[PDB]
Structure formats: structure tokens, C-alpha cells
Amino acid sequence: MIEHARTAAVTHNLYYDEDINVESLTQSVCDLALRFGESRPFGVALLIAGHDADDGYQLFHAEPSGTFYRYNAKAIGS
Amino acid sequence: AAAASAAGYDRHITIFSPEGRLYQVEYAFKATNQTNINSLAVRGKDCTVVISQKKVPDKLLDPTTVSYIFCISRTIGMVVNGPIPDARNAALRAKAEAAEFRYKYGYDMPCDVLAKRMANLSQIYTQRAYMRPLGVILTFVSVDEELGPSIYKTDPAGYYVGYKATATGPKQQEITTNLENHFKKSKIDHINEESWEKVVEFAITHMIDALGTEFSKNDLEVGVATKDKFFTLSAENIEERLVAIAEQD
Amino acid sequence: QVEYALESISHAGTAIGIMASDGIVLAAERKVTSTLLEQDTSTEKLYKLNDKIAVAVAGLTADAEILINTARIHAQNYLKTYNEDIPVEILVRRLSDIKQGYTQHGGLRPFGVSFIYAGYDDRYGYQLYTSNPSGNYTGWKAISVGANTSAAQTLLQMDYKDDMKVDDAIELALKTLSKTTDSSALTYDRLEFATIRKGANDGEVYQKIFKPQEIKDILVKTGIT
């Protein structure tokens, strides 16, 4: 999921000359989990944090289901 | 209609049983008896003949559409013993095979290469766990120019052989025994008559004598193989054969 | 996670390799077989890789012959590439790596065979090696694989001397096999035999993979009838 998210960020940067929105990167790692890489779960819960000029400072819980939510604060793990 | 991974036990897919049997193929033999139709095929001196029973108990059917005799090409035809959907599949396949052969090789598909081709297709359906056997026996007839009058029969295992005469259906063993005892008496490999009018006449007689029931025009179907024409008799032409049996004896 | 493939070879007849101070000695035994199964064939025990290298096999000929042909192809390719023939170490490592791959990759099966690669090259002199389904290989002074491995290795250990001649290694291989034979006598038709020696007199590597009469002659030297 991380090396997919890294490859997704660098490909958007060289396409629009602009930084990826944090929702759109969160969506991309969820699509990977719906594809199972290429109704199964895939991988692990992620907290995804970032800033973009449109929707400001954002925190997302990306889930093994290939779905997500934005949170003002979120705890995961123990 | 694509292939995919799926599960099965040794009698739900074509797989060898502990005793080397393929149950899915033996159960496709039982599917051939389902229509409750008997058929008969015999060789003349310069023709070959195929007679089928016709059952249309349902008064709401158009009887013209109920048909188990199929025209594969100008020279060659078949009768199917089995469910009509599988029969129409086998007919569409045999028509396409014959057209593709006449295109490539430049002469009309012999009856020994069509039965072999259809038997090779049935062997691929007998080793495939993703596709079933067809519930059909196919009897092909023509008056070949290489072997003359020809009957070839193919079955759900992809076995085939040529025949002197044959019968197929629920009561075939009596028709077969009465044919065996005819050739044991006459000692020819054919019915010794020079015109298709006398062979279609002799076949209807044997069908009546074996099944113990008389036929109206509508209870029978007929095929008449001659060089450069396989054809099926209309009911007024079959009436001629039936009217020539009553006047004769 | 391969030990069943190492169990497989334990049944497969027996091969002995013994290295002298001036040569190497491969011996192997054919399993007794049906009267009508053909013997005059390519599927034997003592094969070859090049004019300087020979192998004896335990395990199935169908897994052996692919590796033997790969070795022949790779040895021909090396001689074609450098005009000096392949070192024994590079042949066994090349054959040890192909065999390791088919054991670790779950799309493939471990090769159920273990060859004793005898050879000569000037980088290390005469070289006796064993390789097995795991893809590991070891250098030896003497070794055996397949049937009666344990009994044969004790008789090897208590009689082997580092200074011995090739002729002493002929005796030791034949006497080991006649000590540890499953049949209560040993005969030329069950025995396959080969040597690698220093020429007729000059510097060349001379192989012999012995014909049945030469085997009879060394059996009647060695007092096995």
C-alpha cells in the first residue's frame, strides 16, 4: 500500500505539475484494496495525514475493506 | 460461456472413478433415451435410408417444427437420438464443419471425416470437467463416391463406427435383432432393391414389425440419401410408401 | 521442506566414488529388473558431461537425463566460449543452483536425483563431489549415494588412505560393493564402472567408461570370482 501510494503521488506530480489532494491519494490506496493488488479484505488500517490548498489539513482512516472516513481525531491499534 | 475454476466429485465431472469409469459420460447415454423416439437406418443398392418415429401428443404444437432429421450438406444428413437443444447444437456444429472443409480441401466433406470430427469433439467433452457431454447419438448418412452407401453413428463418449444397418432409441434391441436375423438370412451387406421407393418401403415394414404399432403419415419421418441429394420426405410422399405397404400384402 | 525427495533416492541402487592420489574411480550398481525390460539403452547410472567429467546417479533417470543434458549443453557452451574446458567446481555449482531453484519455487518440484560428479581440471586437480535434491553439494575423498549408503561409508572410512593409487581405488570400490551387495554374489552385468586418469603417459585427461569385458577383467584381478 505504501509503495503504491508513493508511485501514485509521483505519477500525479508529473501529470498536473501540482501536489496530489489527500482524498485522492486515500481513494487510490482503497482502490488497490478493492482490486486485491491486481469482497476480500486487503492489508492493514492506515492513518493518512496531509495538507492541500483545497481541503486544508486532513486525517483519514483507510481500512482493509477498501473504504475510508475523514476524522478530526482517530486512534487505531491497541 | 467462458471457462473458469470450479469444484466437483468423481461423478459430477468427467473424472476416472476408482474403477476407471466416467459416470458423467454413462449418464449422457441415459439422456439419449429421453425423447422416447426410435429410429432406423438401412443401406439400399444406390441409396441409404433413415426412418424416425414422430411423437407430437400435444395438440397445441405445430407438428411441422418437431423434427429429428437434419440436412448437414447437399450430400449428407443425420438423425439425432436425444434432447432437441443438444441435437440443434450438434447440427449447427456439423453444418459449420462441413462448410469449412468444402472451403479448405475443395471436395464435399465425406461421411467418414464428419463422423470422425464430431467424435473427436465429443472426446474433448468427455475429458473436460468445465464442459459436459451432449445427451445425443448422431447417425450420419450419405451415398459416398469413395465407399458408396454409408451409415456412421457417433455417441456421447466420442466412439464411432460405420454400420450395415442400425437402430437407435428405447426399443432398439428388438429392431436390431430383427435386422441381424434379416442379414443372417439374405447374406448381403445391404437391402437388395434398386430404388429408394422400395428401401424406404422395407424400412417402414421392419419398423412396424419390430414396434408392433401401425403408423399414420404423421407417426413417421423419412430420409432418402442419393448421390448429390440427401432429402427428407414430406407427409404426402411418406403416404406413398405407407400406401405401397398396404397394397403389397 | 524437501526431505521426502531425499527419502526417494535411498531406494535407487548404489553409486561409489573414490579419489586417489592420481585419479578418481566411479562404480555403480544397476537394480535387478524384469527379463523383458530393455537394458541396451541411454538410461544407465554412469553417464558423462565432457571428456574430463563423469557422473554416477541415484534417483530416477527421467530427472537425471534433463540435468545431464543441461550439463552437456553448458559444458559444450563453456568450451565453445573459452577454448579451455569447464572446471568441475563450476559444473557442480551450475547444477547445484538449477536444482536449488526447483526446490524453493513452489510452481516446480524438487528433482528426485543425486549425482556423484567426478572430474579433473588444473585449478584444483582431481575433484570428487556429491549433490542432492536440496541443492547443497560437498567435496569428498570418497562418497556413496543411494542403497546401502551407511554400510558402504563405514567400509570406505576404515579402509580409505589419502595416499592410495587409482588401482587401490579400483580395489576399494569393487571390494566395498562386494561387501555391501544386495545380491549374494556380484557380476559384470549389474556393475557400471569408470575411471579418470593422467593420460596414457603424457599430460591429457583420460576417461574410460568400461565395457562389460573390461569389467570382467578387473573382477578377476580383484578376486571377485
Binding site: - | 470450479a6 465431472i13 429421453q34 440443434r88 457431454p133 | -
Partner: protein
């Protein structure tokens, strides 16, 4: 004992139990019928009204293929929609290639082959529909019923769905009493009578009678719906007869 769990399998009898179970889905559908006339085909169906919220002019049970083939079905609703789409594109394919309207028997075989293919592989299920279809071509009137096995025949009159027993029995009386063949105007009236007689087993639900016809004299051999006064005349015939 496991022969009935997947689609390719023959039972020990040599029958495909998943296709036996697909025709149980057809037997739970709304009753629909067809009548072969002297020069055409009439189709009729009981359209069950499930609530006031359905937009009344846009739920239509009778389906049009090309311009000369009428179609109606009983059982799974997504499966009927798929056979009607195969039908529309199969007819449009022949019309593009040969520039002439598809023969009803050739159209029927292309569907029979499609539906039979869905009995071959265990990677798919059968269709849960029987289709009654028919029309007028160069050879005159044709009426067909096609079933989940890919089996089809030509009919004089055809019935499928929940009321099929009562409808078959009435259709036999039409055939017995009119052995020359019915006019399209009388076949419309007589089809309305058979759908009302089929609904008396199901009186708990409201229904709309829906009729269409395709006749060489009444419709120039183009398939059209029975609308306005003729529909109401056929309703009033079915209503005096059901008393």
C-alpha cells in the same frame, strides 16, 4: 445427492436438475400467452399491480424485437430482460448484414443456441425464463415458446407462468372449436378471456390486462399494442365471460 448443485451435471437419470429448478422459477412468474391467427400473432399477459407508485404507462410486460417480432416471458425479471436484449441485438445484426428482416425460425434458433450454451458449463447458471415470441415474415405467421433448456417449438397457441394449466386447457378449446384458425380480432377477444380466466386463481392481487398483436391485415405485419376502444371491447368480452 449433489447432482443438483451445479449446472453441467447429469443426474443418474441423464437429466440436468439445475434446468429442472430453472423452470420452477418460470412457474412462479405472471401468466402470459400467445395466439397464432390466420395472418399473425396476438400476445397477452397479467401485469400484477404491486403499488400505486409505479408509473402506469412505463411498466410494459410485452417486449418488442426489431419491428415484426413480439416477445413475452415468465420467471426471473433480469433474465427476461437479458434474452430480450440478446434478441434485439441478434435481429439488428441480421438486419445490418443481410439488409432484410430476420426469419422468425432463424431468430428462434439463434436464441435456442444461446440458451442451450448456458446449460453446458458449470461456470454459469441456466436462464430462469420461458419466452413466448413470434411474428410475421416472408412465410407468414410464426409463434414460438423457448424454455430454460434452450428447447423451443412452433405453437398454435402457447402459455407460460403461474396460470399456464388453466390457460393451456382454454387454448385447447380455441384450437378444437376453430380448426380453420382464428381471425386477429377474435384472437384479441379470446386472449383477454384466457388472461381473466387465469387470474381467478390469483384474485387477491390487482392486475392490468396487456395485449399486443402483429397481423398482415390489421397491422401490415408490424407488431403493435392493443389500445383504446378495442382493448376495452376485449375487456368487456372477458368481463361478461368471467361471470
Amino acid at each position: 445427492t449433489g447432482y443438483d448443485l451445479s449446472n453441467s451435471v447429469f443426474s443418474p437419470d441423464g437429466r440436468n436438475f439445475q434446468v429442472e429448478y430453472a423452470v420452477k422459477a418460470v412457474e412462479n412468474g405472471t401468466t402470459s400467452i400467445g395466439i397464432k391467427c390466420n395472418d399473425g400473432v396476438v400476445f397477452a399477459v397479467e401485469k400484477l399491480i404491486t403499488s400505486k407508485l409505479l408509473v402506469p404507462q412505463k411498466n410494459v410486460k410485452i417486449q418488442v424485437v426489431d419491428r415484426h417480432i413480439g416477445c413475452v416471458y415468465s420467471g426471473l425479471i433480469p433474465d427476461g430482460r437479458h434474452l430480450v436484449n440478446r434478441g434485439r441485438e441478434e435481429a439488428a445484426s441480421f438486419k445490418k448484414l443481410y439488409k432484410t428482416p430476420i426469419p422468425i425460425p432463424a431468430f428462434a434458433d439463434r436464441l435456442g443456441q444461446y440458451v442451450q450454451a448456458h446449460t453446458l458449463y458449470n461456470s454459469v447458471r441456466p436462464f430462469g425464463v420461458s419466452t413466448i415470441f413470434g411474428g410475421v415474415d416472408k412465410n407468414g405467421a410464426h409463434l414460438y415458446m423457448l424454455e430454460p433448456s434452450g428447447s423451443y417449438w412452433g405453437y398454435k397457441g402457447a402459455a407460460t407462468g403461474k396460470g399456464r394449466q388453466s390457460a393451456k386447457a382454454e387454448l385447447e378449446k380455441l384450437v378444437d372449436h376453430h380448426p380453420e384458425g382464428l381471425s386477429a380480432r377474435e384472437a384479441v377477444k379470446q386472449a383477454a378471456k384466457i388472461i381473466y380466466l387465469a387470474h381467478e386463481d390469483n384474485k387477491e392481487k390487482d392486475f392490468e390486462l396487456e395485449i399486443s398483436w402483429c397481423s398482415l391485415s390489421e397491422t401490415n405485419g408490424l407488431h403493435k399494442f392493443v389500445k383504446g376502444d378495442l382493448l376495452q371491447e376485449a375487456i368487456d368480452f372477458a368481463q361478461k365471460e368471467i361471470n
